Design an enzyme around this catalytic site. Structure first.
Site, PDB file in Angstrom:
ATOM      1  N   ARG A   1      58.333  82.204  94.257  1.00  0.00           N
ATOM      2  CA  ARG A   1      57.528  81.776  95.402  1.00  0.00           C
ATOM      3  C   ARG A   1      58.355  81.174  96.522  1.00  0.00           C
ATOM      4  O   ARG A   1      59.132  80.242  96.304  1.00  0.00           O
ATOM      5  CB  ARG A   1      56.500  80.750  94.975  1.00  0.00           C
TER       6      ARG A   1
ATOM      7  N   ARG B   1      53.369  84.790  94.787  1.00  0.00           N
ATOM      8  CA  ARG B   1      54.508  85.265  94.036  1.00  0.00           C
ATOM      9  C   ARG B   1      54.897  86.620  94.634  1.00  0.00           C
ATOM     10  O   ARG B   1      54.031  87.496  94.831  1.00  0.00           O
ATOM     11  CB  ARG B   1      54.200  85.395  92.541  1.00  0.00           C
TER      12      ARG B   1
ATOM     13  N   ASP C   1      59.241  90.091  91.004  1.00  0.00           N
ATOM     14  CA  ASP C   1      58.989  90.591  89.660  1.00  0.00           C
ATOM     15  C   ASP C   1      60.280  90.850  88.947  1.00  0.00           C
ATOM     16  O   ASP C   1      61.215  91.413  89.519  1.00  0.00           O
ATOM     17  CB  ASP C   1      58.252  91.937  89.699  1.00  0.00           C
TER      18      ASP C   1
ATOM     19  N   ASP D   1      61.158  92.739  85.331  1.00  0.00           N
ATOM     20  CA  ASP D   1      60.604  93.510  84.212  1.00  0.00           C
ATOM     21  C   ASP D   1      61.731  93.874  83.272  1.00  0.00           C
ATOM     22  O   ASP D   1      62.778  94.285  83.715  1.00  0.00           O
ATOM     23  CB  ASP D   1      59.930  94.770  84.737  1.00  0.00           C
TER      24      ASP D   1
HETATM   25  N1  LIG Z   1      57.767 100.291  95.624  1.00  0.00           N
HETATM   26  C1  LIG Z   1      57.297  99.440  94.645  1.00  0.00           C
HETATM   27  N2  LIG Z   1      55.935  99.373  94.498  1.00  0.00           N
HETATM   28  C2  LIG Z   1      55.478  98.505  93.510  1.00  0.00           C
HETATM   29  N3  LIG Z   1      54.082  98.446  93.376  1.00  0.00           N
HETATM   30  C3  LIG Z   1      53.633  97.621  92.440  1.00  0.00           C
HETATM   31  C4  LIG Z   1      54.485  96.845  91.608  1.00  0.00           C
HETATM   32  C5  LIG Z   1      53.741  95.983  90.605  1.00  0.00           C
HETATM   33  N4  LIG Z   1      54.527  94.922  90.007  1.00  0.00           N
HETATM   34  C6  LIG Z   1      55.359  95.421  88.880  1.00  0.00           C
HETATM   35  C7  LIG Z   1      55.400  94.265  87.861  1.00  0.00           C
HETATM   36  N5  LIG Z   1      54.142  94.365  87.078  1.00  0.00           N
HETATM   37  C8  LIG Z   1      53.066  93.413  87.506  1.00  0.00           C
HETATM   38  C9  LIG Z   1      53.071  92.031  86.820  1.00  0.00           C
HETATM   39  C10 LIG Z   1      53.201  92.219  85.305  1.00  0.00           C
HETATM   40  S1  LIG Z   1      53.311  90.571  84.480  1.00  0.00           S
HETATM   41  C11 LIG Z   1      52.159  90.619  83.087  1.00  0.00           C
HETATM   42  C12 LIG Z   1      52.679  90.518  81.639  1.00  0.00           C
HETATM   43  O1  LIG Z   1      53.491  91.621  81.286  1.00  0.00           O
HETATM   44  C13 LIG Z   1      53.938  91.317  79.980  1.00  0.00           C
HETATM   45  N6  LIG Z   1      54.970  92.251  79.701  1.00  0.00           N
HETATM   46  C14 LIG Z   1      54.861  93.264  78.768  1.00  0.00           C
HETATM   47  N7  LIG Z   1      55.942  94.015  78.716  1.00  0.00           N
HETATM   48  C15 LIG Z   1      56.785  93.498  79.654  1.00  0.00           C
HETATM   49  C16 LIG Z   1      58.064  93.900  80.034  1.00  0.00           C
HETATM   50  N8  LIG Z   1      58.610  94.957  79.392  1.00  0.00           N
HETATM   51  N9  LIG Z   1      58.725  93.181  81.024  1.00  0.00           N
HETATM   52  C17 LIG Z   1      58.053  92.121  81.573  1.00  0.00           C
HETATM   53  N10 LIG Z   1      56.818  91.645  81.284  1.00  0.00           N
HETATM   54  C18 LIG Z   1      56.220  92.374  80.307  1.00  0.00           C
HETATM   55  C19 LIG Z   1      54.350  89.807  79.991  1.00  0.00           C
HETATM   56  O2  LIG Z   1      54.105  89.180  78.779  1.00  0.00           O
HETATM   57  C20 LIG Z   1      53.494  89.272  81.192  1.00  0.00           C
HETATM   58  O3  LIG Z   1      52.706  88.241  80.720  1.00  0.00           O
HETATM   59  C21 LIG Z   1      54.469  93.019  84.966  1.00  0.00           C
HETATM   60  C22 LIG Z   1      54.381  94.398  85.606  1.00  0.00           C
HETATM   61  N11 LIG Z   1      55.853  96.861  91.718  1.00  0.00           N
HETATM   62  C23 LIG Z   1      56.337  97.717  92.687  1.00  0.00           C
HETATM   63  C24 LIG Z   1      57.793  97.810  92.859  1.00  0.00           C
HETATM   64  O4  LIG Z   1      58.644  97.209  92.242  1.00  0.00           O
HETATM   65  N12 LIG Z   1      58.224  98.715  93.882  1.00  0.00           N
END
Ligand SMILES: Nc1nc2ncc(CNCCN3CCC(SC[C@H]4O[C@@H](n5cnc6c(N)ncnc65)[C@H](O)[C@@H]4O)CC3)nc2c(=O)[nH]1
Length: 158
Positions: free
Chosen positions: A82, A92, A95, A97
């Protein structure tokens, strides 16, 4: 163990947020960064009025267990995710991952590894291909093959 981590930020100016997250990743205990992909600018999934994302991949050597690494990545999102928005804290915008964790397959309430949707996301697969072109998934699919089969467009650098 080599863990591959995807970084994304959709702040208007995300470089300093992304730099701070990389610094914080390198400070995780019993871990250290091996490689960082270039930084790529990608359009957002969906509404196109939204800000572009900065995406990158990071290779992290670690002796942590997977859920311990996840605890760190989640702490980093809370502490760094943030940005101050003048009169208050913004949404937020960062991200982190976990894309891969060694050759492990993980399916728990907290963690799905390999990441549940990375096979559909050029913005995840291309930066990973830059740093790990010979990568093989736990099921035997090759990263190169997934990109060859789907023919996702190459990304622009930030
Ligand atoms: N161009 C472009 N467009 C995008 N459009 C949308 C997004 C969306 N955000 C990706 C992250 N999104 C959302 C929040 C959730 S956050 C919920 C939950 O995910 C669980 N999780 C399960 N597996 C996980 C793993 N392998 N890594 C981490 N967390 C894990 C974790 O326990 C957490 O509580 C994790 C996944 N990103 C992009 C981007 O980048 N680029």
């Amino acid at each position: 163990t080599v863990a591959y981590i995807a970084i994304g930020s959709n702040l208007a100016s995300p470089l300093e947020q992304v730099n701070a997250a990389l610094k914080a990743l390198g400070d995780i205990p019993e871990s250290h960064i091996l490689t960082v992909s270039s930084f790529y600018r990608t359009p957002p999934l969906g509404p196109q009025d939204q800000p572009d994302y900065l995406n990158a991949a990071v290779a992290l050597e670690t002796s942590l267990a997977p859920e311990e690494l996840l605890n760190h990545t989640q702490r980093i999102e809370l502490q760094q995710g943030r940005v101050r928005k003048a009169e208050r804290w913004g949404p937020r915008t960062l991200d982190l991952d976990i894309m891969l964790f060694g050759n492990e397959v993980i399916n728990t309430e907290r963690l799905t590894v390999p990441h549940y949707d990375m096979k559909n996301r050029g913005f995840m697969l291309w930066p990973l291909f830059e740093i790990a072109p010979e990568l093989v998934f736990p099921d035997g699919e090759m990263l190169r093959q997934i990109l060859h089969t789907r023919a996702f467009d190459k990304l622009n650098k930030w």
